[PDB]
Structure 1
């Protein structure tokens, strides 16, 4: 234990889509899966990052070799969502905050590798492959592949066309079997699947999370307790509505995977607390309106504040706030 079947279940649970199941099962019969997730080092990560972090936790539980790519060059190429001056600073802020998140979840930062894009994306071998890729990829396909991912501006920049090619080559240079990201990466993933073989590199397994509504949409990982409180009961959460509910989604994609259960906090009057061992049970009760929006929010607020506390405390040290300020001036 875990068997290949248990590993496959941990790796794929809560995803919207799995591309490459045949190869995924072939690998898992024999060895650990090598997988990575990338994030461009752009705006301050917020509590919604707990969603991909929960999948990273799952990968690590399944025994996967996991790489996290801090894609600083990608931040630069995507309409300068980060300038060159600030890239090193934002890489450090991202690395710190992602490590704190994973620590807070209780994930062995063990088979976990952190790498930043400019560690290898400016090397001669990689650059040579960027030019080879450029010689088989049409402008049309590269503009198409990036449409849901890079900022769409009225006069498209060349950098925006380069972005998906580099993301494709990243699969080969990080030497992984698989890449995980949101469903909005799908066109880049199929682009990699199409073009890496023209360079003599193999296609990868691709794992995609659904688009998950936010808790608000704005809660920062360093927001203090009363700001978390303040922001939560302005959140959208209609009685009985189990669609497009950011509070239910957060529970489904983060709190259940984290603990295998979820506790609703309710007054004695309305039945007292209840412990759910599966999301579908909680969903049924919410649909029936015997879990009120206010109690759902209070239950999430307690759980979430538990997740943020060690992060807030770790960034409470001198120099981490100078880092926070300097990263985002």
Structure 2
């Protein structure tokens, strides 16, 4: 209440791929799943962050124990002439904004934990494991693991070969059963499943979201005012009838629909009035049939997106949080 079958459904809905279904069902028969998701604390997050956060809300509703890793070491390793002070302010900005997002969605936070990479990634046991891994992984396997996640420059840096191992070790040191991310990370994830056992650690379940087209094609910032949300959405590409490549519809599929397993299309009387959909495939079929117009779909998103963003804007309107946003992103 929820059953193991209900838990699995919530945990795995809207994913592109599940690695490790067997172990996943074994766990869910007995106890709550332990899972993490990592984000590097570089770049101001924008509305597209709702796509991962929606899965994090599903994990929490399931009853999972959920860790969010703020990967501040990776952030330092992009810009070392950026002070630890600016970096850690970006860490708090991320922490506050993630919390505000999950609060806006409305999800129990009792089993949520926040951890920074530097809390453990420079400890002696972890470091030693980094060296052990390095003496079993080839440069070739490391390079191929990082290809879709580490920016292939002119002469590549040594740091890029280390990322797949550090991310694998994260699964162990965070003591999780599973890691969630994007399908982009698949090669990092299979690298972890391959090499953790060589250090005597268990392979993890890997849950992968699809790559989802952006809402807007000046991305919508989590703190943008209503007026700028409107302006930015009216600019967004929606092609009539197009359901395969539609960032407005993907936002509904991955963020708005799962809120309540409901979505309301706002439509004038002339075209039939509002309609409430209880499965996404029904919206998709009306959109493909062109009885939901792009402008009405954008509208229905604008309203629901604004309702999501309002509590975050209010929370971040305190002097303490206003000062943080200004100092994190100067």
Q: TM-score range by the shorter chain?
A: over 0.9
**Cα deviation code 1:56-115 (max 9, x no counterpart):** 111111111100000111223357697644221110000000000000000111100110
**Cα deviation code 1:101-133 (max 9, x no counterpart):** 000000111100110100000101101101111
Aligned to 1:319, what secondary structure does the other structure show?
helix
Shift of 1:243: 1.3
The structure-2 alpha-carbon separation of the partners of 1:79 and 1:86, relative to structure 1 and needing over 3 Å to count, comes to closer
Give the Cα separation in 2 of the matches to 1:78 and 1:57: 29
Question: Which residue of 2 is the match for residue 56 of structure 1?
Answer: 56
Aligned to 2:67, what secondary structure does the other structure show?
strand
Contact 1:45 1:220 in 2 (8 A): yes
Corresponding pairs, count:
329
Aligned to 2:109, what secondary structure does the other structure show?
coil
The structure-2 alpha-carbon separation of the partners of 1:17 and 1:65, relative to structure 1 and needing over 3 Å to count, comes to same
Mind listing any 5+ residue stretches in structure 1 that lack a counterpart? none
Give the Cα separation in 1 of the matches to 2:143 and 2:328: 30
The structure-2 alpha-carbon separation of the partners of 1:55 and 1:224, relative to structure 1 and needing over 3 Å to count, comes to same
Give the Cα separation in 2 of the matches to 1:174 and 1:273: 46
Provide the TM-score with structure 1 as the length reference: 0.98
Mind listing any 5+ residue stretches in structure 2 that lack a counterpart? none
Aligned to 2:291, what secondary structure does the other structure show?
coil
Larger mean CA deviation between 146-155 and 225-234 belongs to 146-155
Indicate yes or no: 2:289 matched with 1:288.
Answer: yes
Give the Cα separation in 2 of the matches to 1:149 and 1:126: 22
Larger mean CA deviation between 224-233 and 75-84 belongs to 75-84
Shift of 1:151: 2.1
Give the Cα separation in 1 of the matches to 2:292 and 2:64: 37
Contact 1:78 1:150 in 2 (8 A): no
Give the Cα separation in 2 of the matches to 1:98 and 1:302: 21
Aligned to 1:207, what secondary structure does the other structure show?
strand
The structure-2 alpha-carbon separation of the partners of 1:168 and 1:17, relative to structure 1 and needing over 3 Å to count, comes to same
Give the Cα separation in 2 of the matches to 1:231 and 1:181: 27
Shift of 1:322: 2.1
Larger mean CA deviation between 70-79 and 295-304 belongs to 70-79
Give the Cα separation in 2 of the matches to 1:165 and 1:90: 24
Provide the TM-score with structure 2 as the length reference: 0.97
Aligned to 2:215, what secondary structure does the other structure show?
coil
